[PDB]
Design an enzyme around this catalytic site. Structure first.
Site, PDB file in Angstrom:
ATOM      1  N   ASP A 105       0.830  -1.203   0.000  1.00 21.71           N
ATOM      2  CA  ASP A 105       0.000   0.000   0.000  1.00 21.71           C
ATOM      3  C   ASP A 105       0.866   1.254   0.000  1.00 21.71           C
ATOM      4  O   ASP A 105       1.377   1.658   1.047  1.00 21.71           O
ATOM      5  CB  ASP A 105      -0.876  -0.017   1.250  1.00 21.71           C
ATOM      6  CG  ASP A 105      -1.806   1.174   1.342  1.00 21.71           C
ATOM      7  OD1 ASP A 105      -1.948   1.884   0.323  1.00 21.71           O
ATOM      8  OD2 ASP A 105      -2.401   1.380   2.436  1.00 21.71           O
ATOM      9  N   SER A 107      -0.686  15.601 -12.059  1.00 19.40           N
ATOM     10  CA  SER A 107      -0.937  15.238 -13.441  1.00 19.40           C
ATOM     11  C   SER A 107      -1.190  16.494 -14.264  1.00 19.40           C
ATOM     12  O   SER A 107      -1.722  17.483 -13.766  1.00 19.40           O
ATOM     13  CB  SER A 107      -2.134  14.288 -13.506  1.00 19.40           C
ATOM     14  OG  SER A 107      -2.546  14.026 -14.833  1.00 19.40           O
TER      15      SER A 107
END
Length: 330
Positions: free
Chosen positions: A35, A199
């Protein structure tokens, strides 16, 4: 040193991935959920409340000659999905894919929430975010990666998750045969303890690319792709009959649909998520309403590039003094 381990979807939907991890001496192999959105290595154990164990493999520290109680240390964690677990702490030898760390904090669960009990395939979590998020008190502990880092050939790990198929986590090297083209690297902020990056935009299907900054986290422990409501609405508007359902808890779509792809930007590069990666199947057995793999982050408070996004790429988690993230097509 290096390590290399195969990671395997837990079910036919890729709801999560499990990777075998050796703990203790002799080795006890548990299948852990790696994770990159958390920083605790915790396991089902011989100390876990009996009624909360249902098919998981447990770690028994009393059977490990290298286990030592970390005196006075406790831990307690709550995840974004509302699940939780807590307990005490041992140090022991932990190996992943041939890479060994001695003195790793292994957090033994005394209590786990129902979602963990109900998932027989996940024996615990191995956190790979920054150690500043580790919950051990009163002495915070380091992640497996942080402990291994100085010994690694290069201070990196990579995630290569499969679509409905196994994939690979590598530590200490970049497998140049595992991706196509070049890897595009992008800046990381560690201010919130995550692999947080920005992004450069998105496209839906064959549509034009929208240049827009989307701050979010690369999180292997989250199943879906959670993005701003504007972006998500633009995606689902291209699927006939798709709608947001408050009763179900997100966007659903007719199972008869053909889903468009979703592209996200990494600098000037582009990662394309095929439409099929966005299908999470019937909302309940036999239903013709299917659950979408792109969902709104509104009210999470952060955008999350979870498995839906990451499995479309070869992803480098670069833990150099100034960390960065790399993405390649594959």
């Amino acid at each position: 040193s290096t390590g290399s381990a195969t990671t395997t979807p837990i079910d036919s939907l890729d709801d999560a991935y499990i990777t075998p991890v050796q703990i203790g001496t002799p080795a006890q192999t548990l299948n852990l959920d790696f994770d990159t959105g958390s920083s605790d290595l915790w396991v089902f154990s011989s100390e876990t409340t009996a009624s909360e164990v249902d098919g998981q493999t447990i770690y028994t520290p009393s059977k490990s000659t290298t286990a030592k109680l970390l005196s006075g240390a406790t831990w307690s964690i709550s995840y974004g999905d509302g699940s939780s677990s807590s307990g005490d702490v041992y140090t022991d030898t932990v190996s992943v894919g041939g890479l060994t760390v001695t003195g790793q904090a292994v957090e033994s669960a005394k209590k786990v929430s129902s979602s963990f009990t109900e998932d027989s395939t996940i024996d615990g979590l191995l956190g790979l975010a920054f150690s500043t998020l580790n919950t051990v008190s009163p002495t915070q502990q380091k992640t497996f990666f942080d402990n291994a880092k100085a010994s690694l050939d290069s201070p990196v790990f990579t995630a290569d998750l499969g679509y409905h198929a196994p994939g690979t986590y590598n530590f200490g090297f970049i497998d140049t045969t595992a991706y196509t083209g070049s890897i595009t690297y992008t800046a990381v902020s560690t201010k919130q303890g995550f692999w947080e990056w920005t992004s450069t935009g998105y496209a839906v299907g064959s549509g034009t690319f929208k240049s827009t900054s989307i701050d979010g986290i690369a999180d292997t422990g989250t199943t879906l792709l959670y993005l701003p409501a504007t972006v998500v609405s633009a995606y689902w508007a291209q699927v006939s009959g798709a709608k947001s359902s408050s009763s179900v808890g997100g966007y659903v779509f007719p199972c008869s649909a053909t889903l468009p792809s979703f592209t996200f930007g990494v600098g000037s590069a582009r990662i394309v998520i095929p439409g099929d990666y966005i299908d999470f199947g019937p909302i309940s057995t036999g239903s013709s309403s299917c659950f979408g793999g792109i969902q709104s982050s509104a009210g999470i408070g952060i955008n999350i590039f979870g498995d839906v996004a990451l499995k479309a790429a070869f992803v480098v988690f670069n833990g150099a003094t100034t960390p960065t993230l790399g993405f390649a097509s594959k």
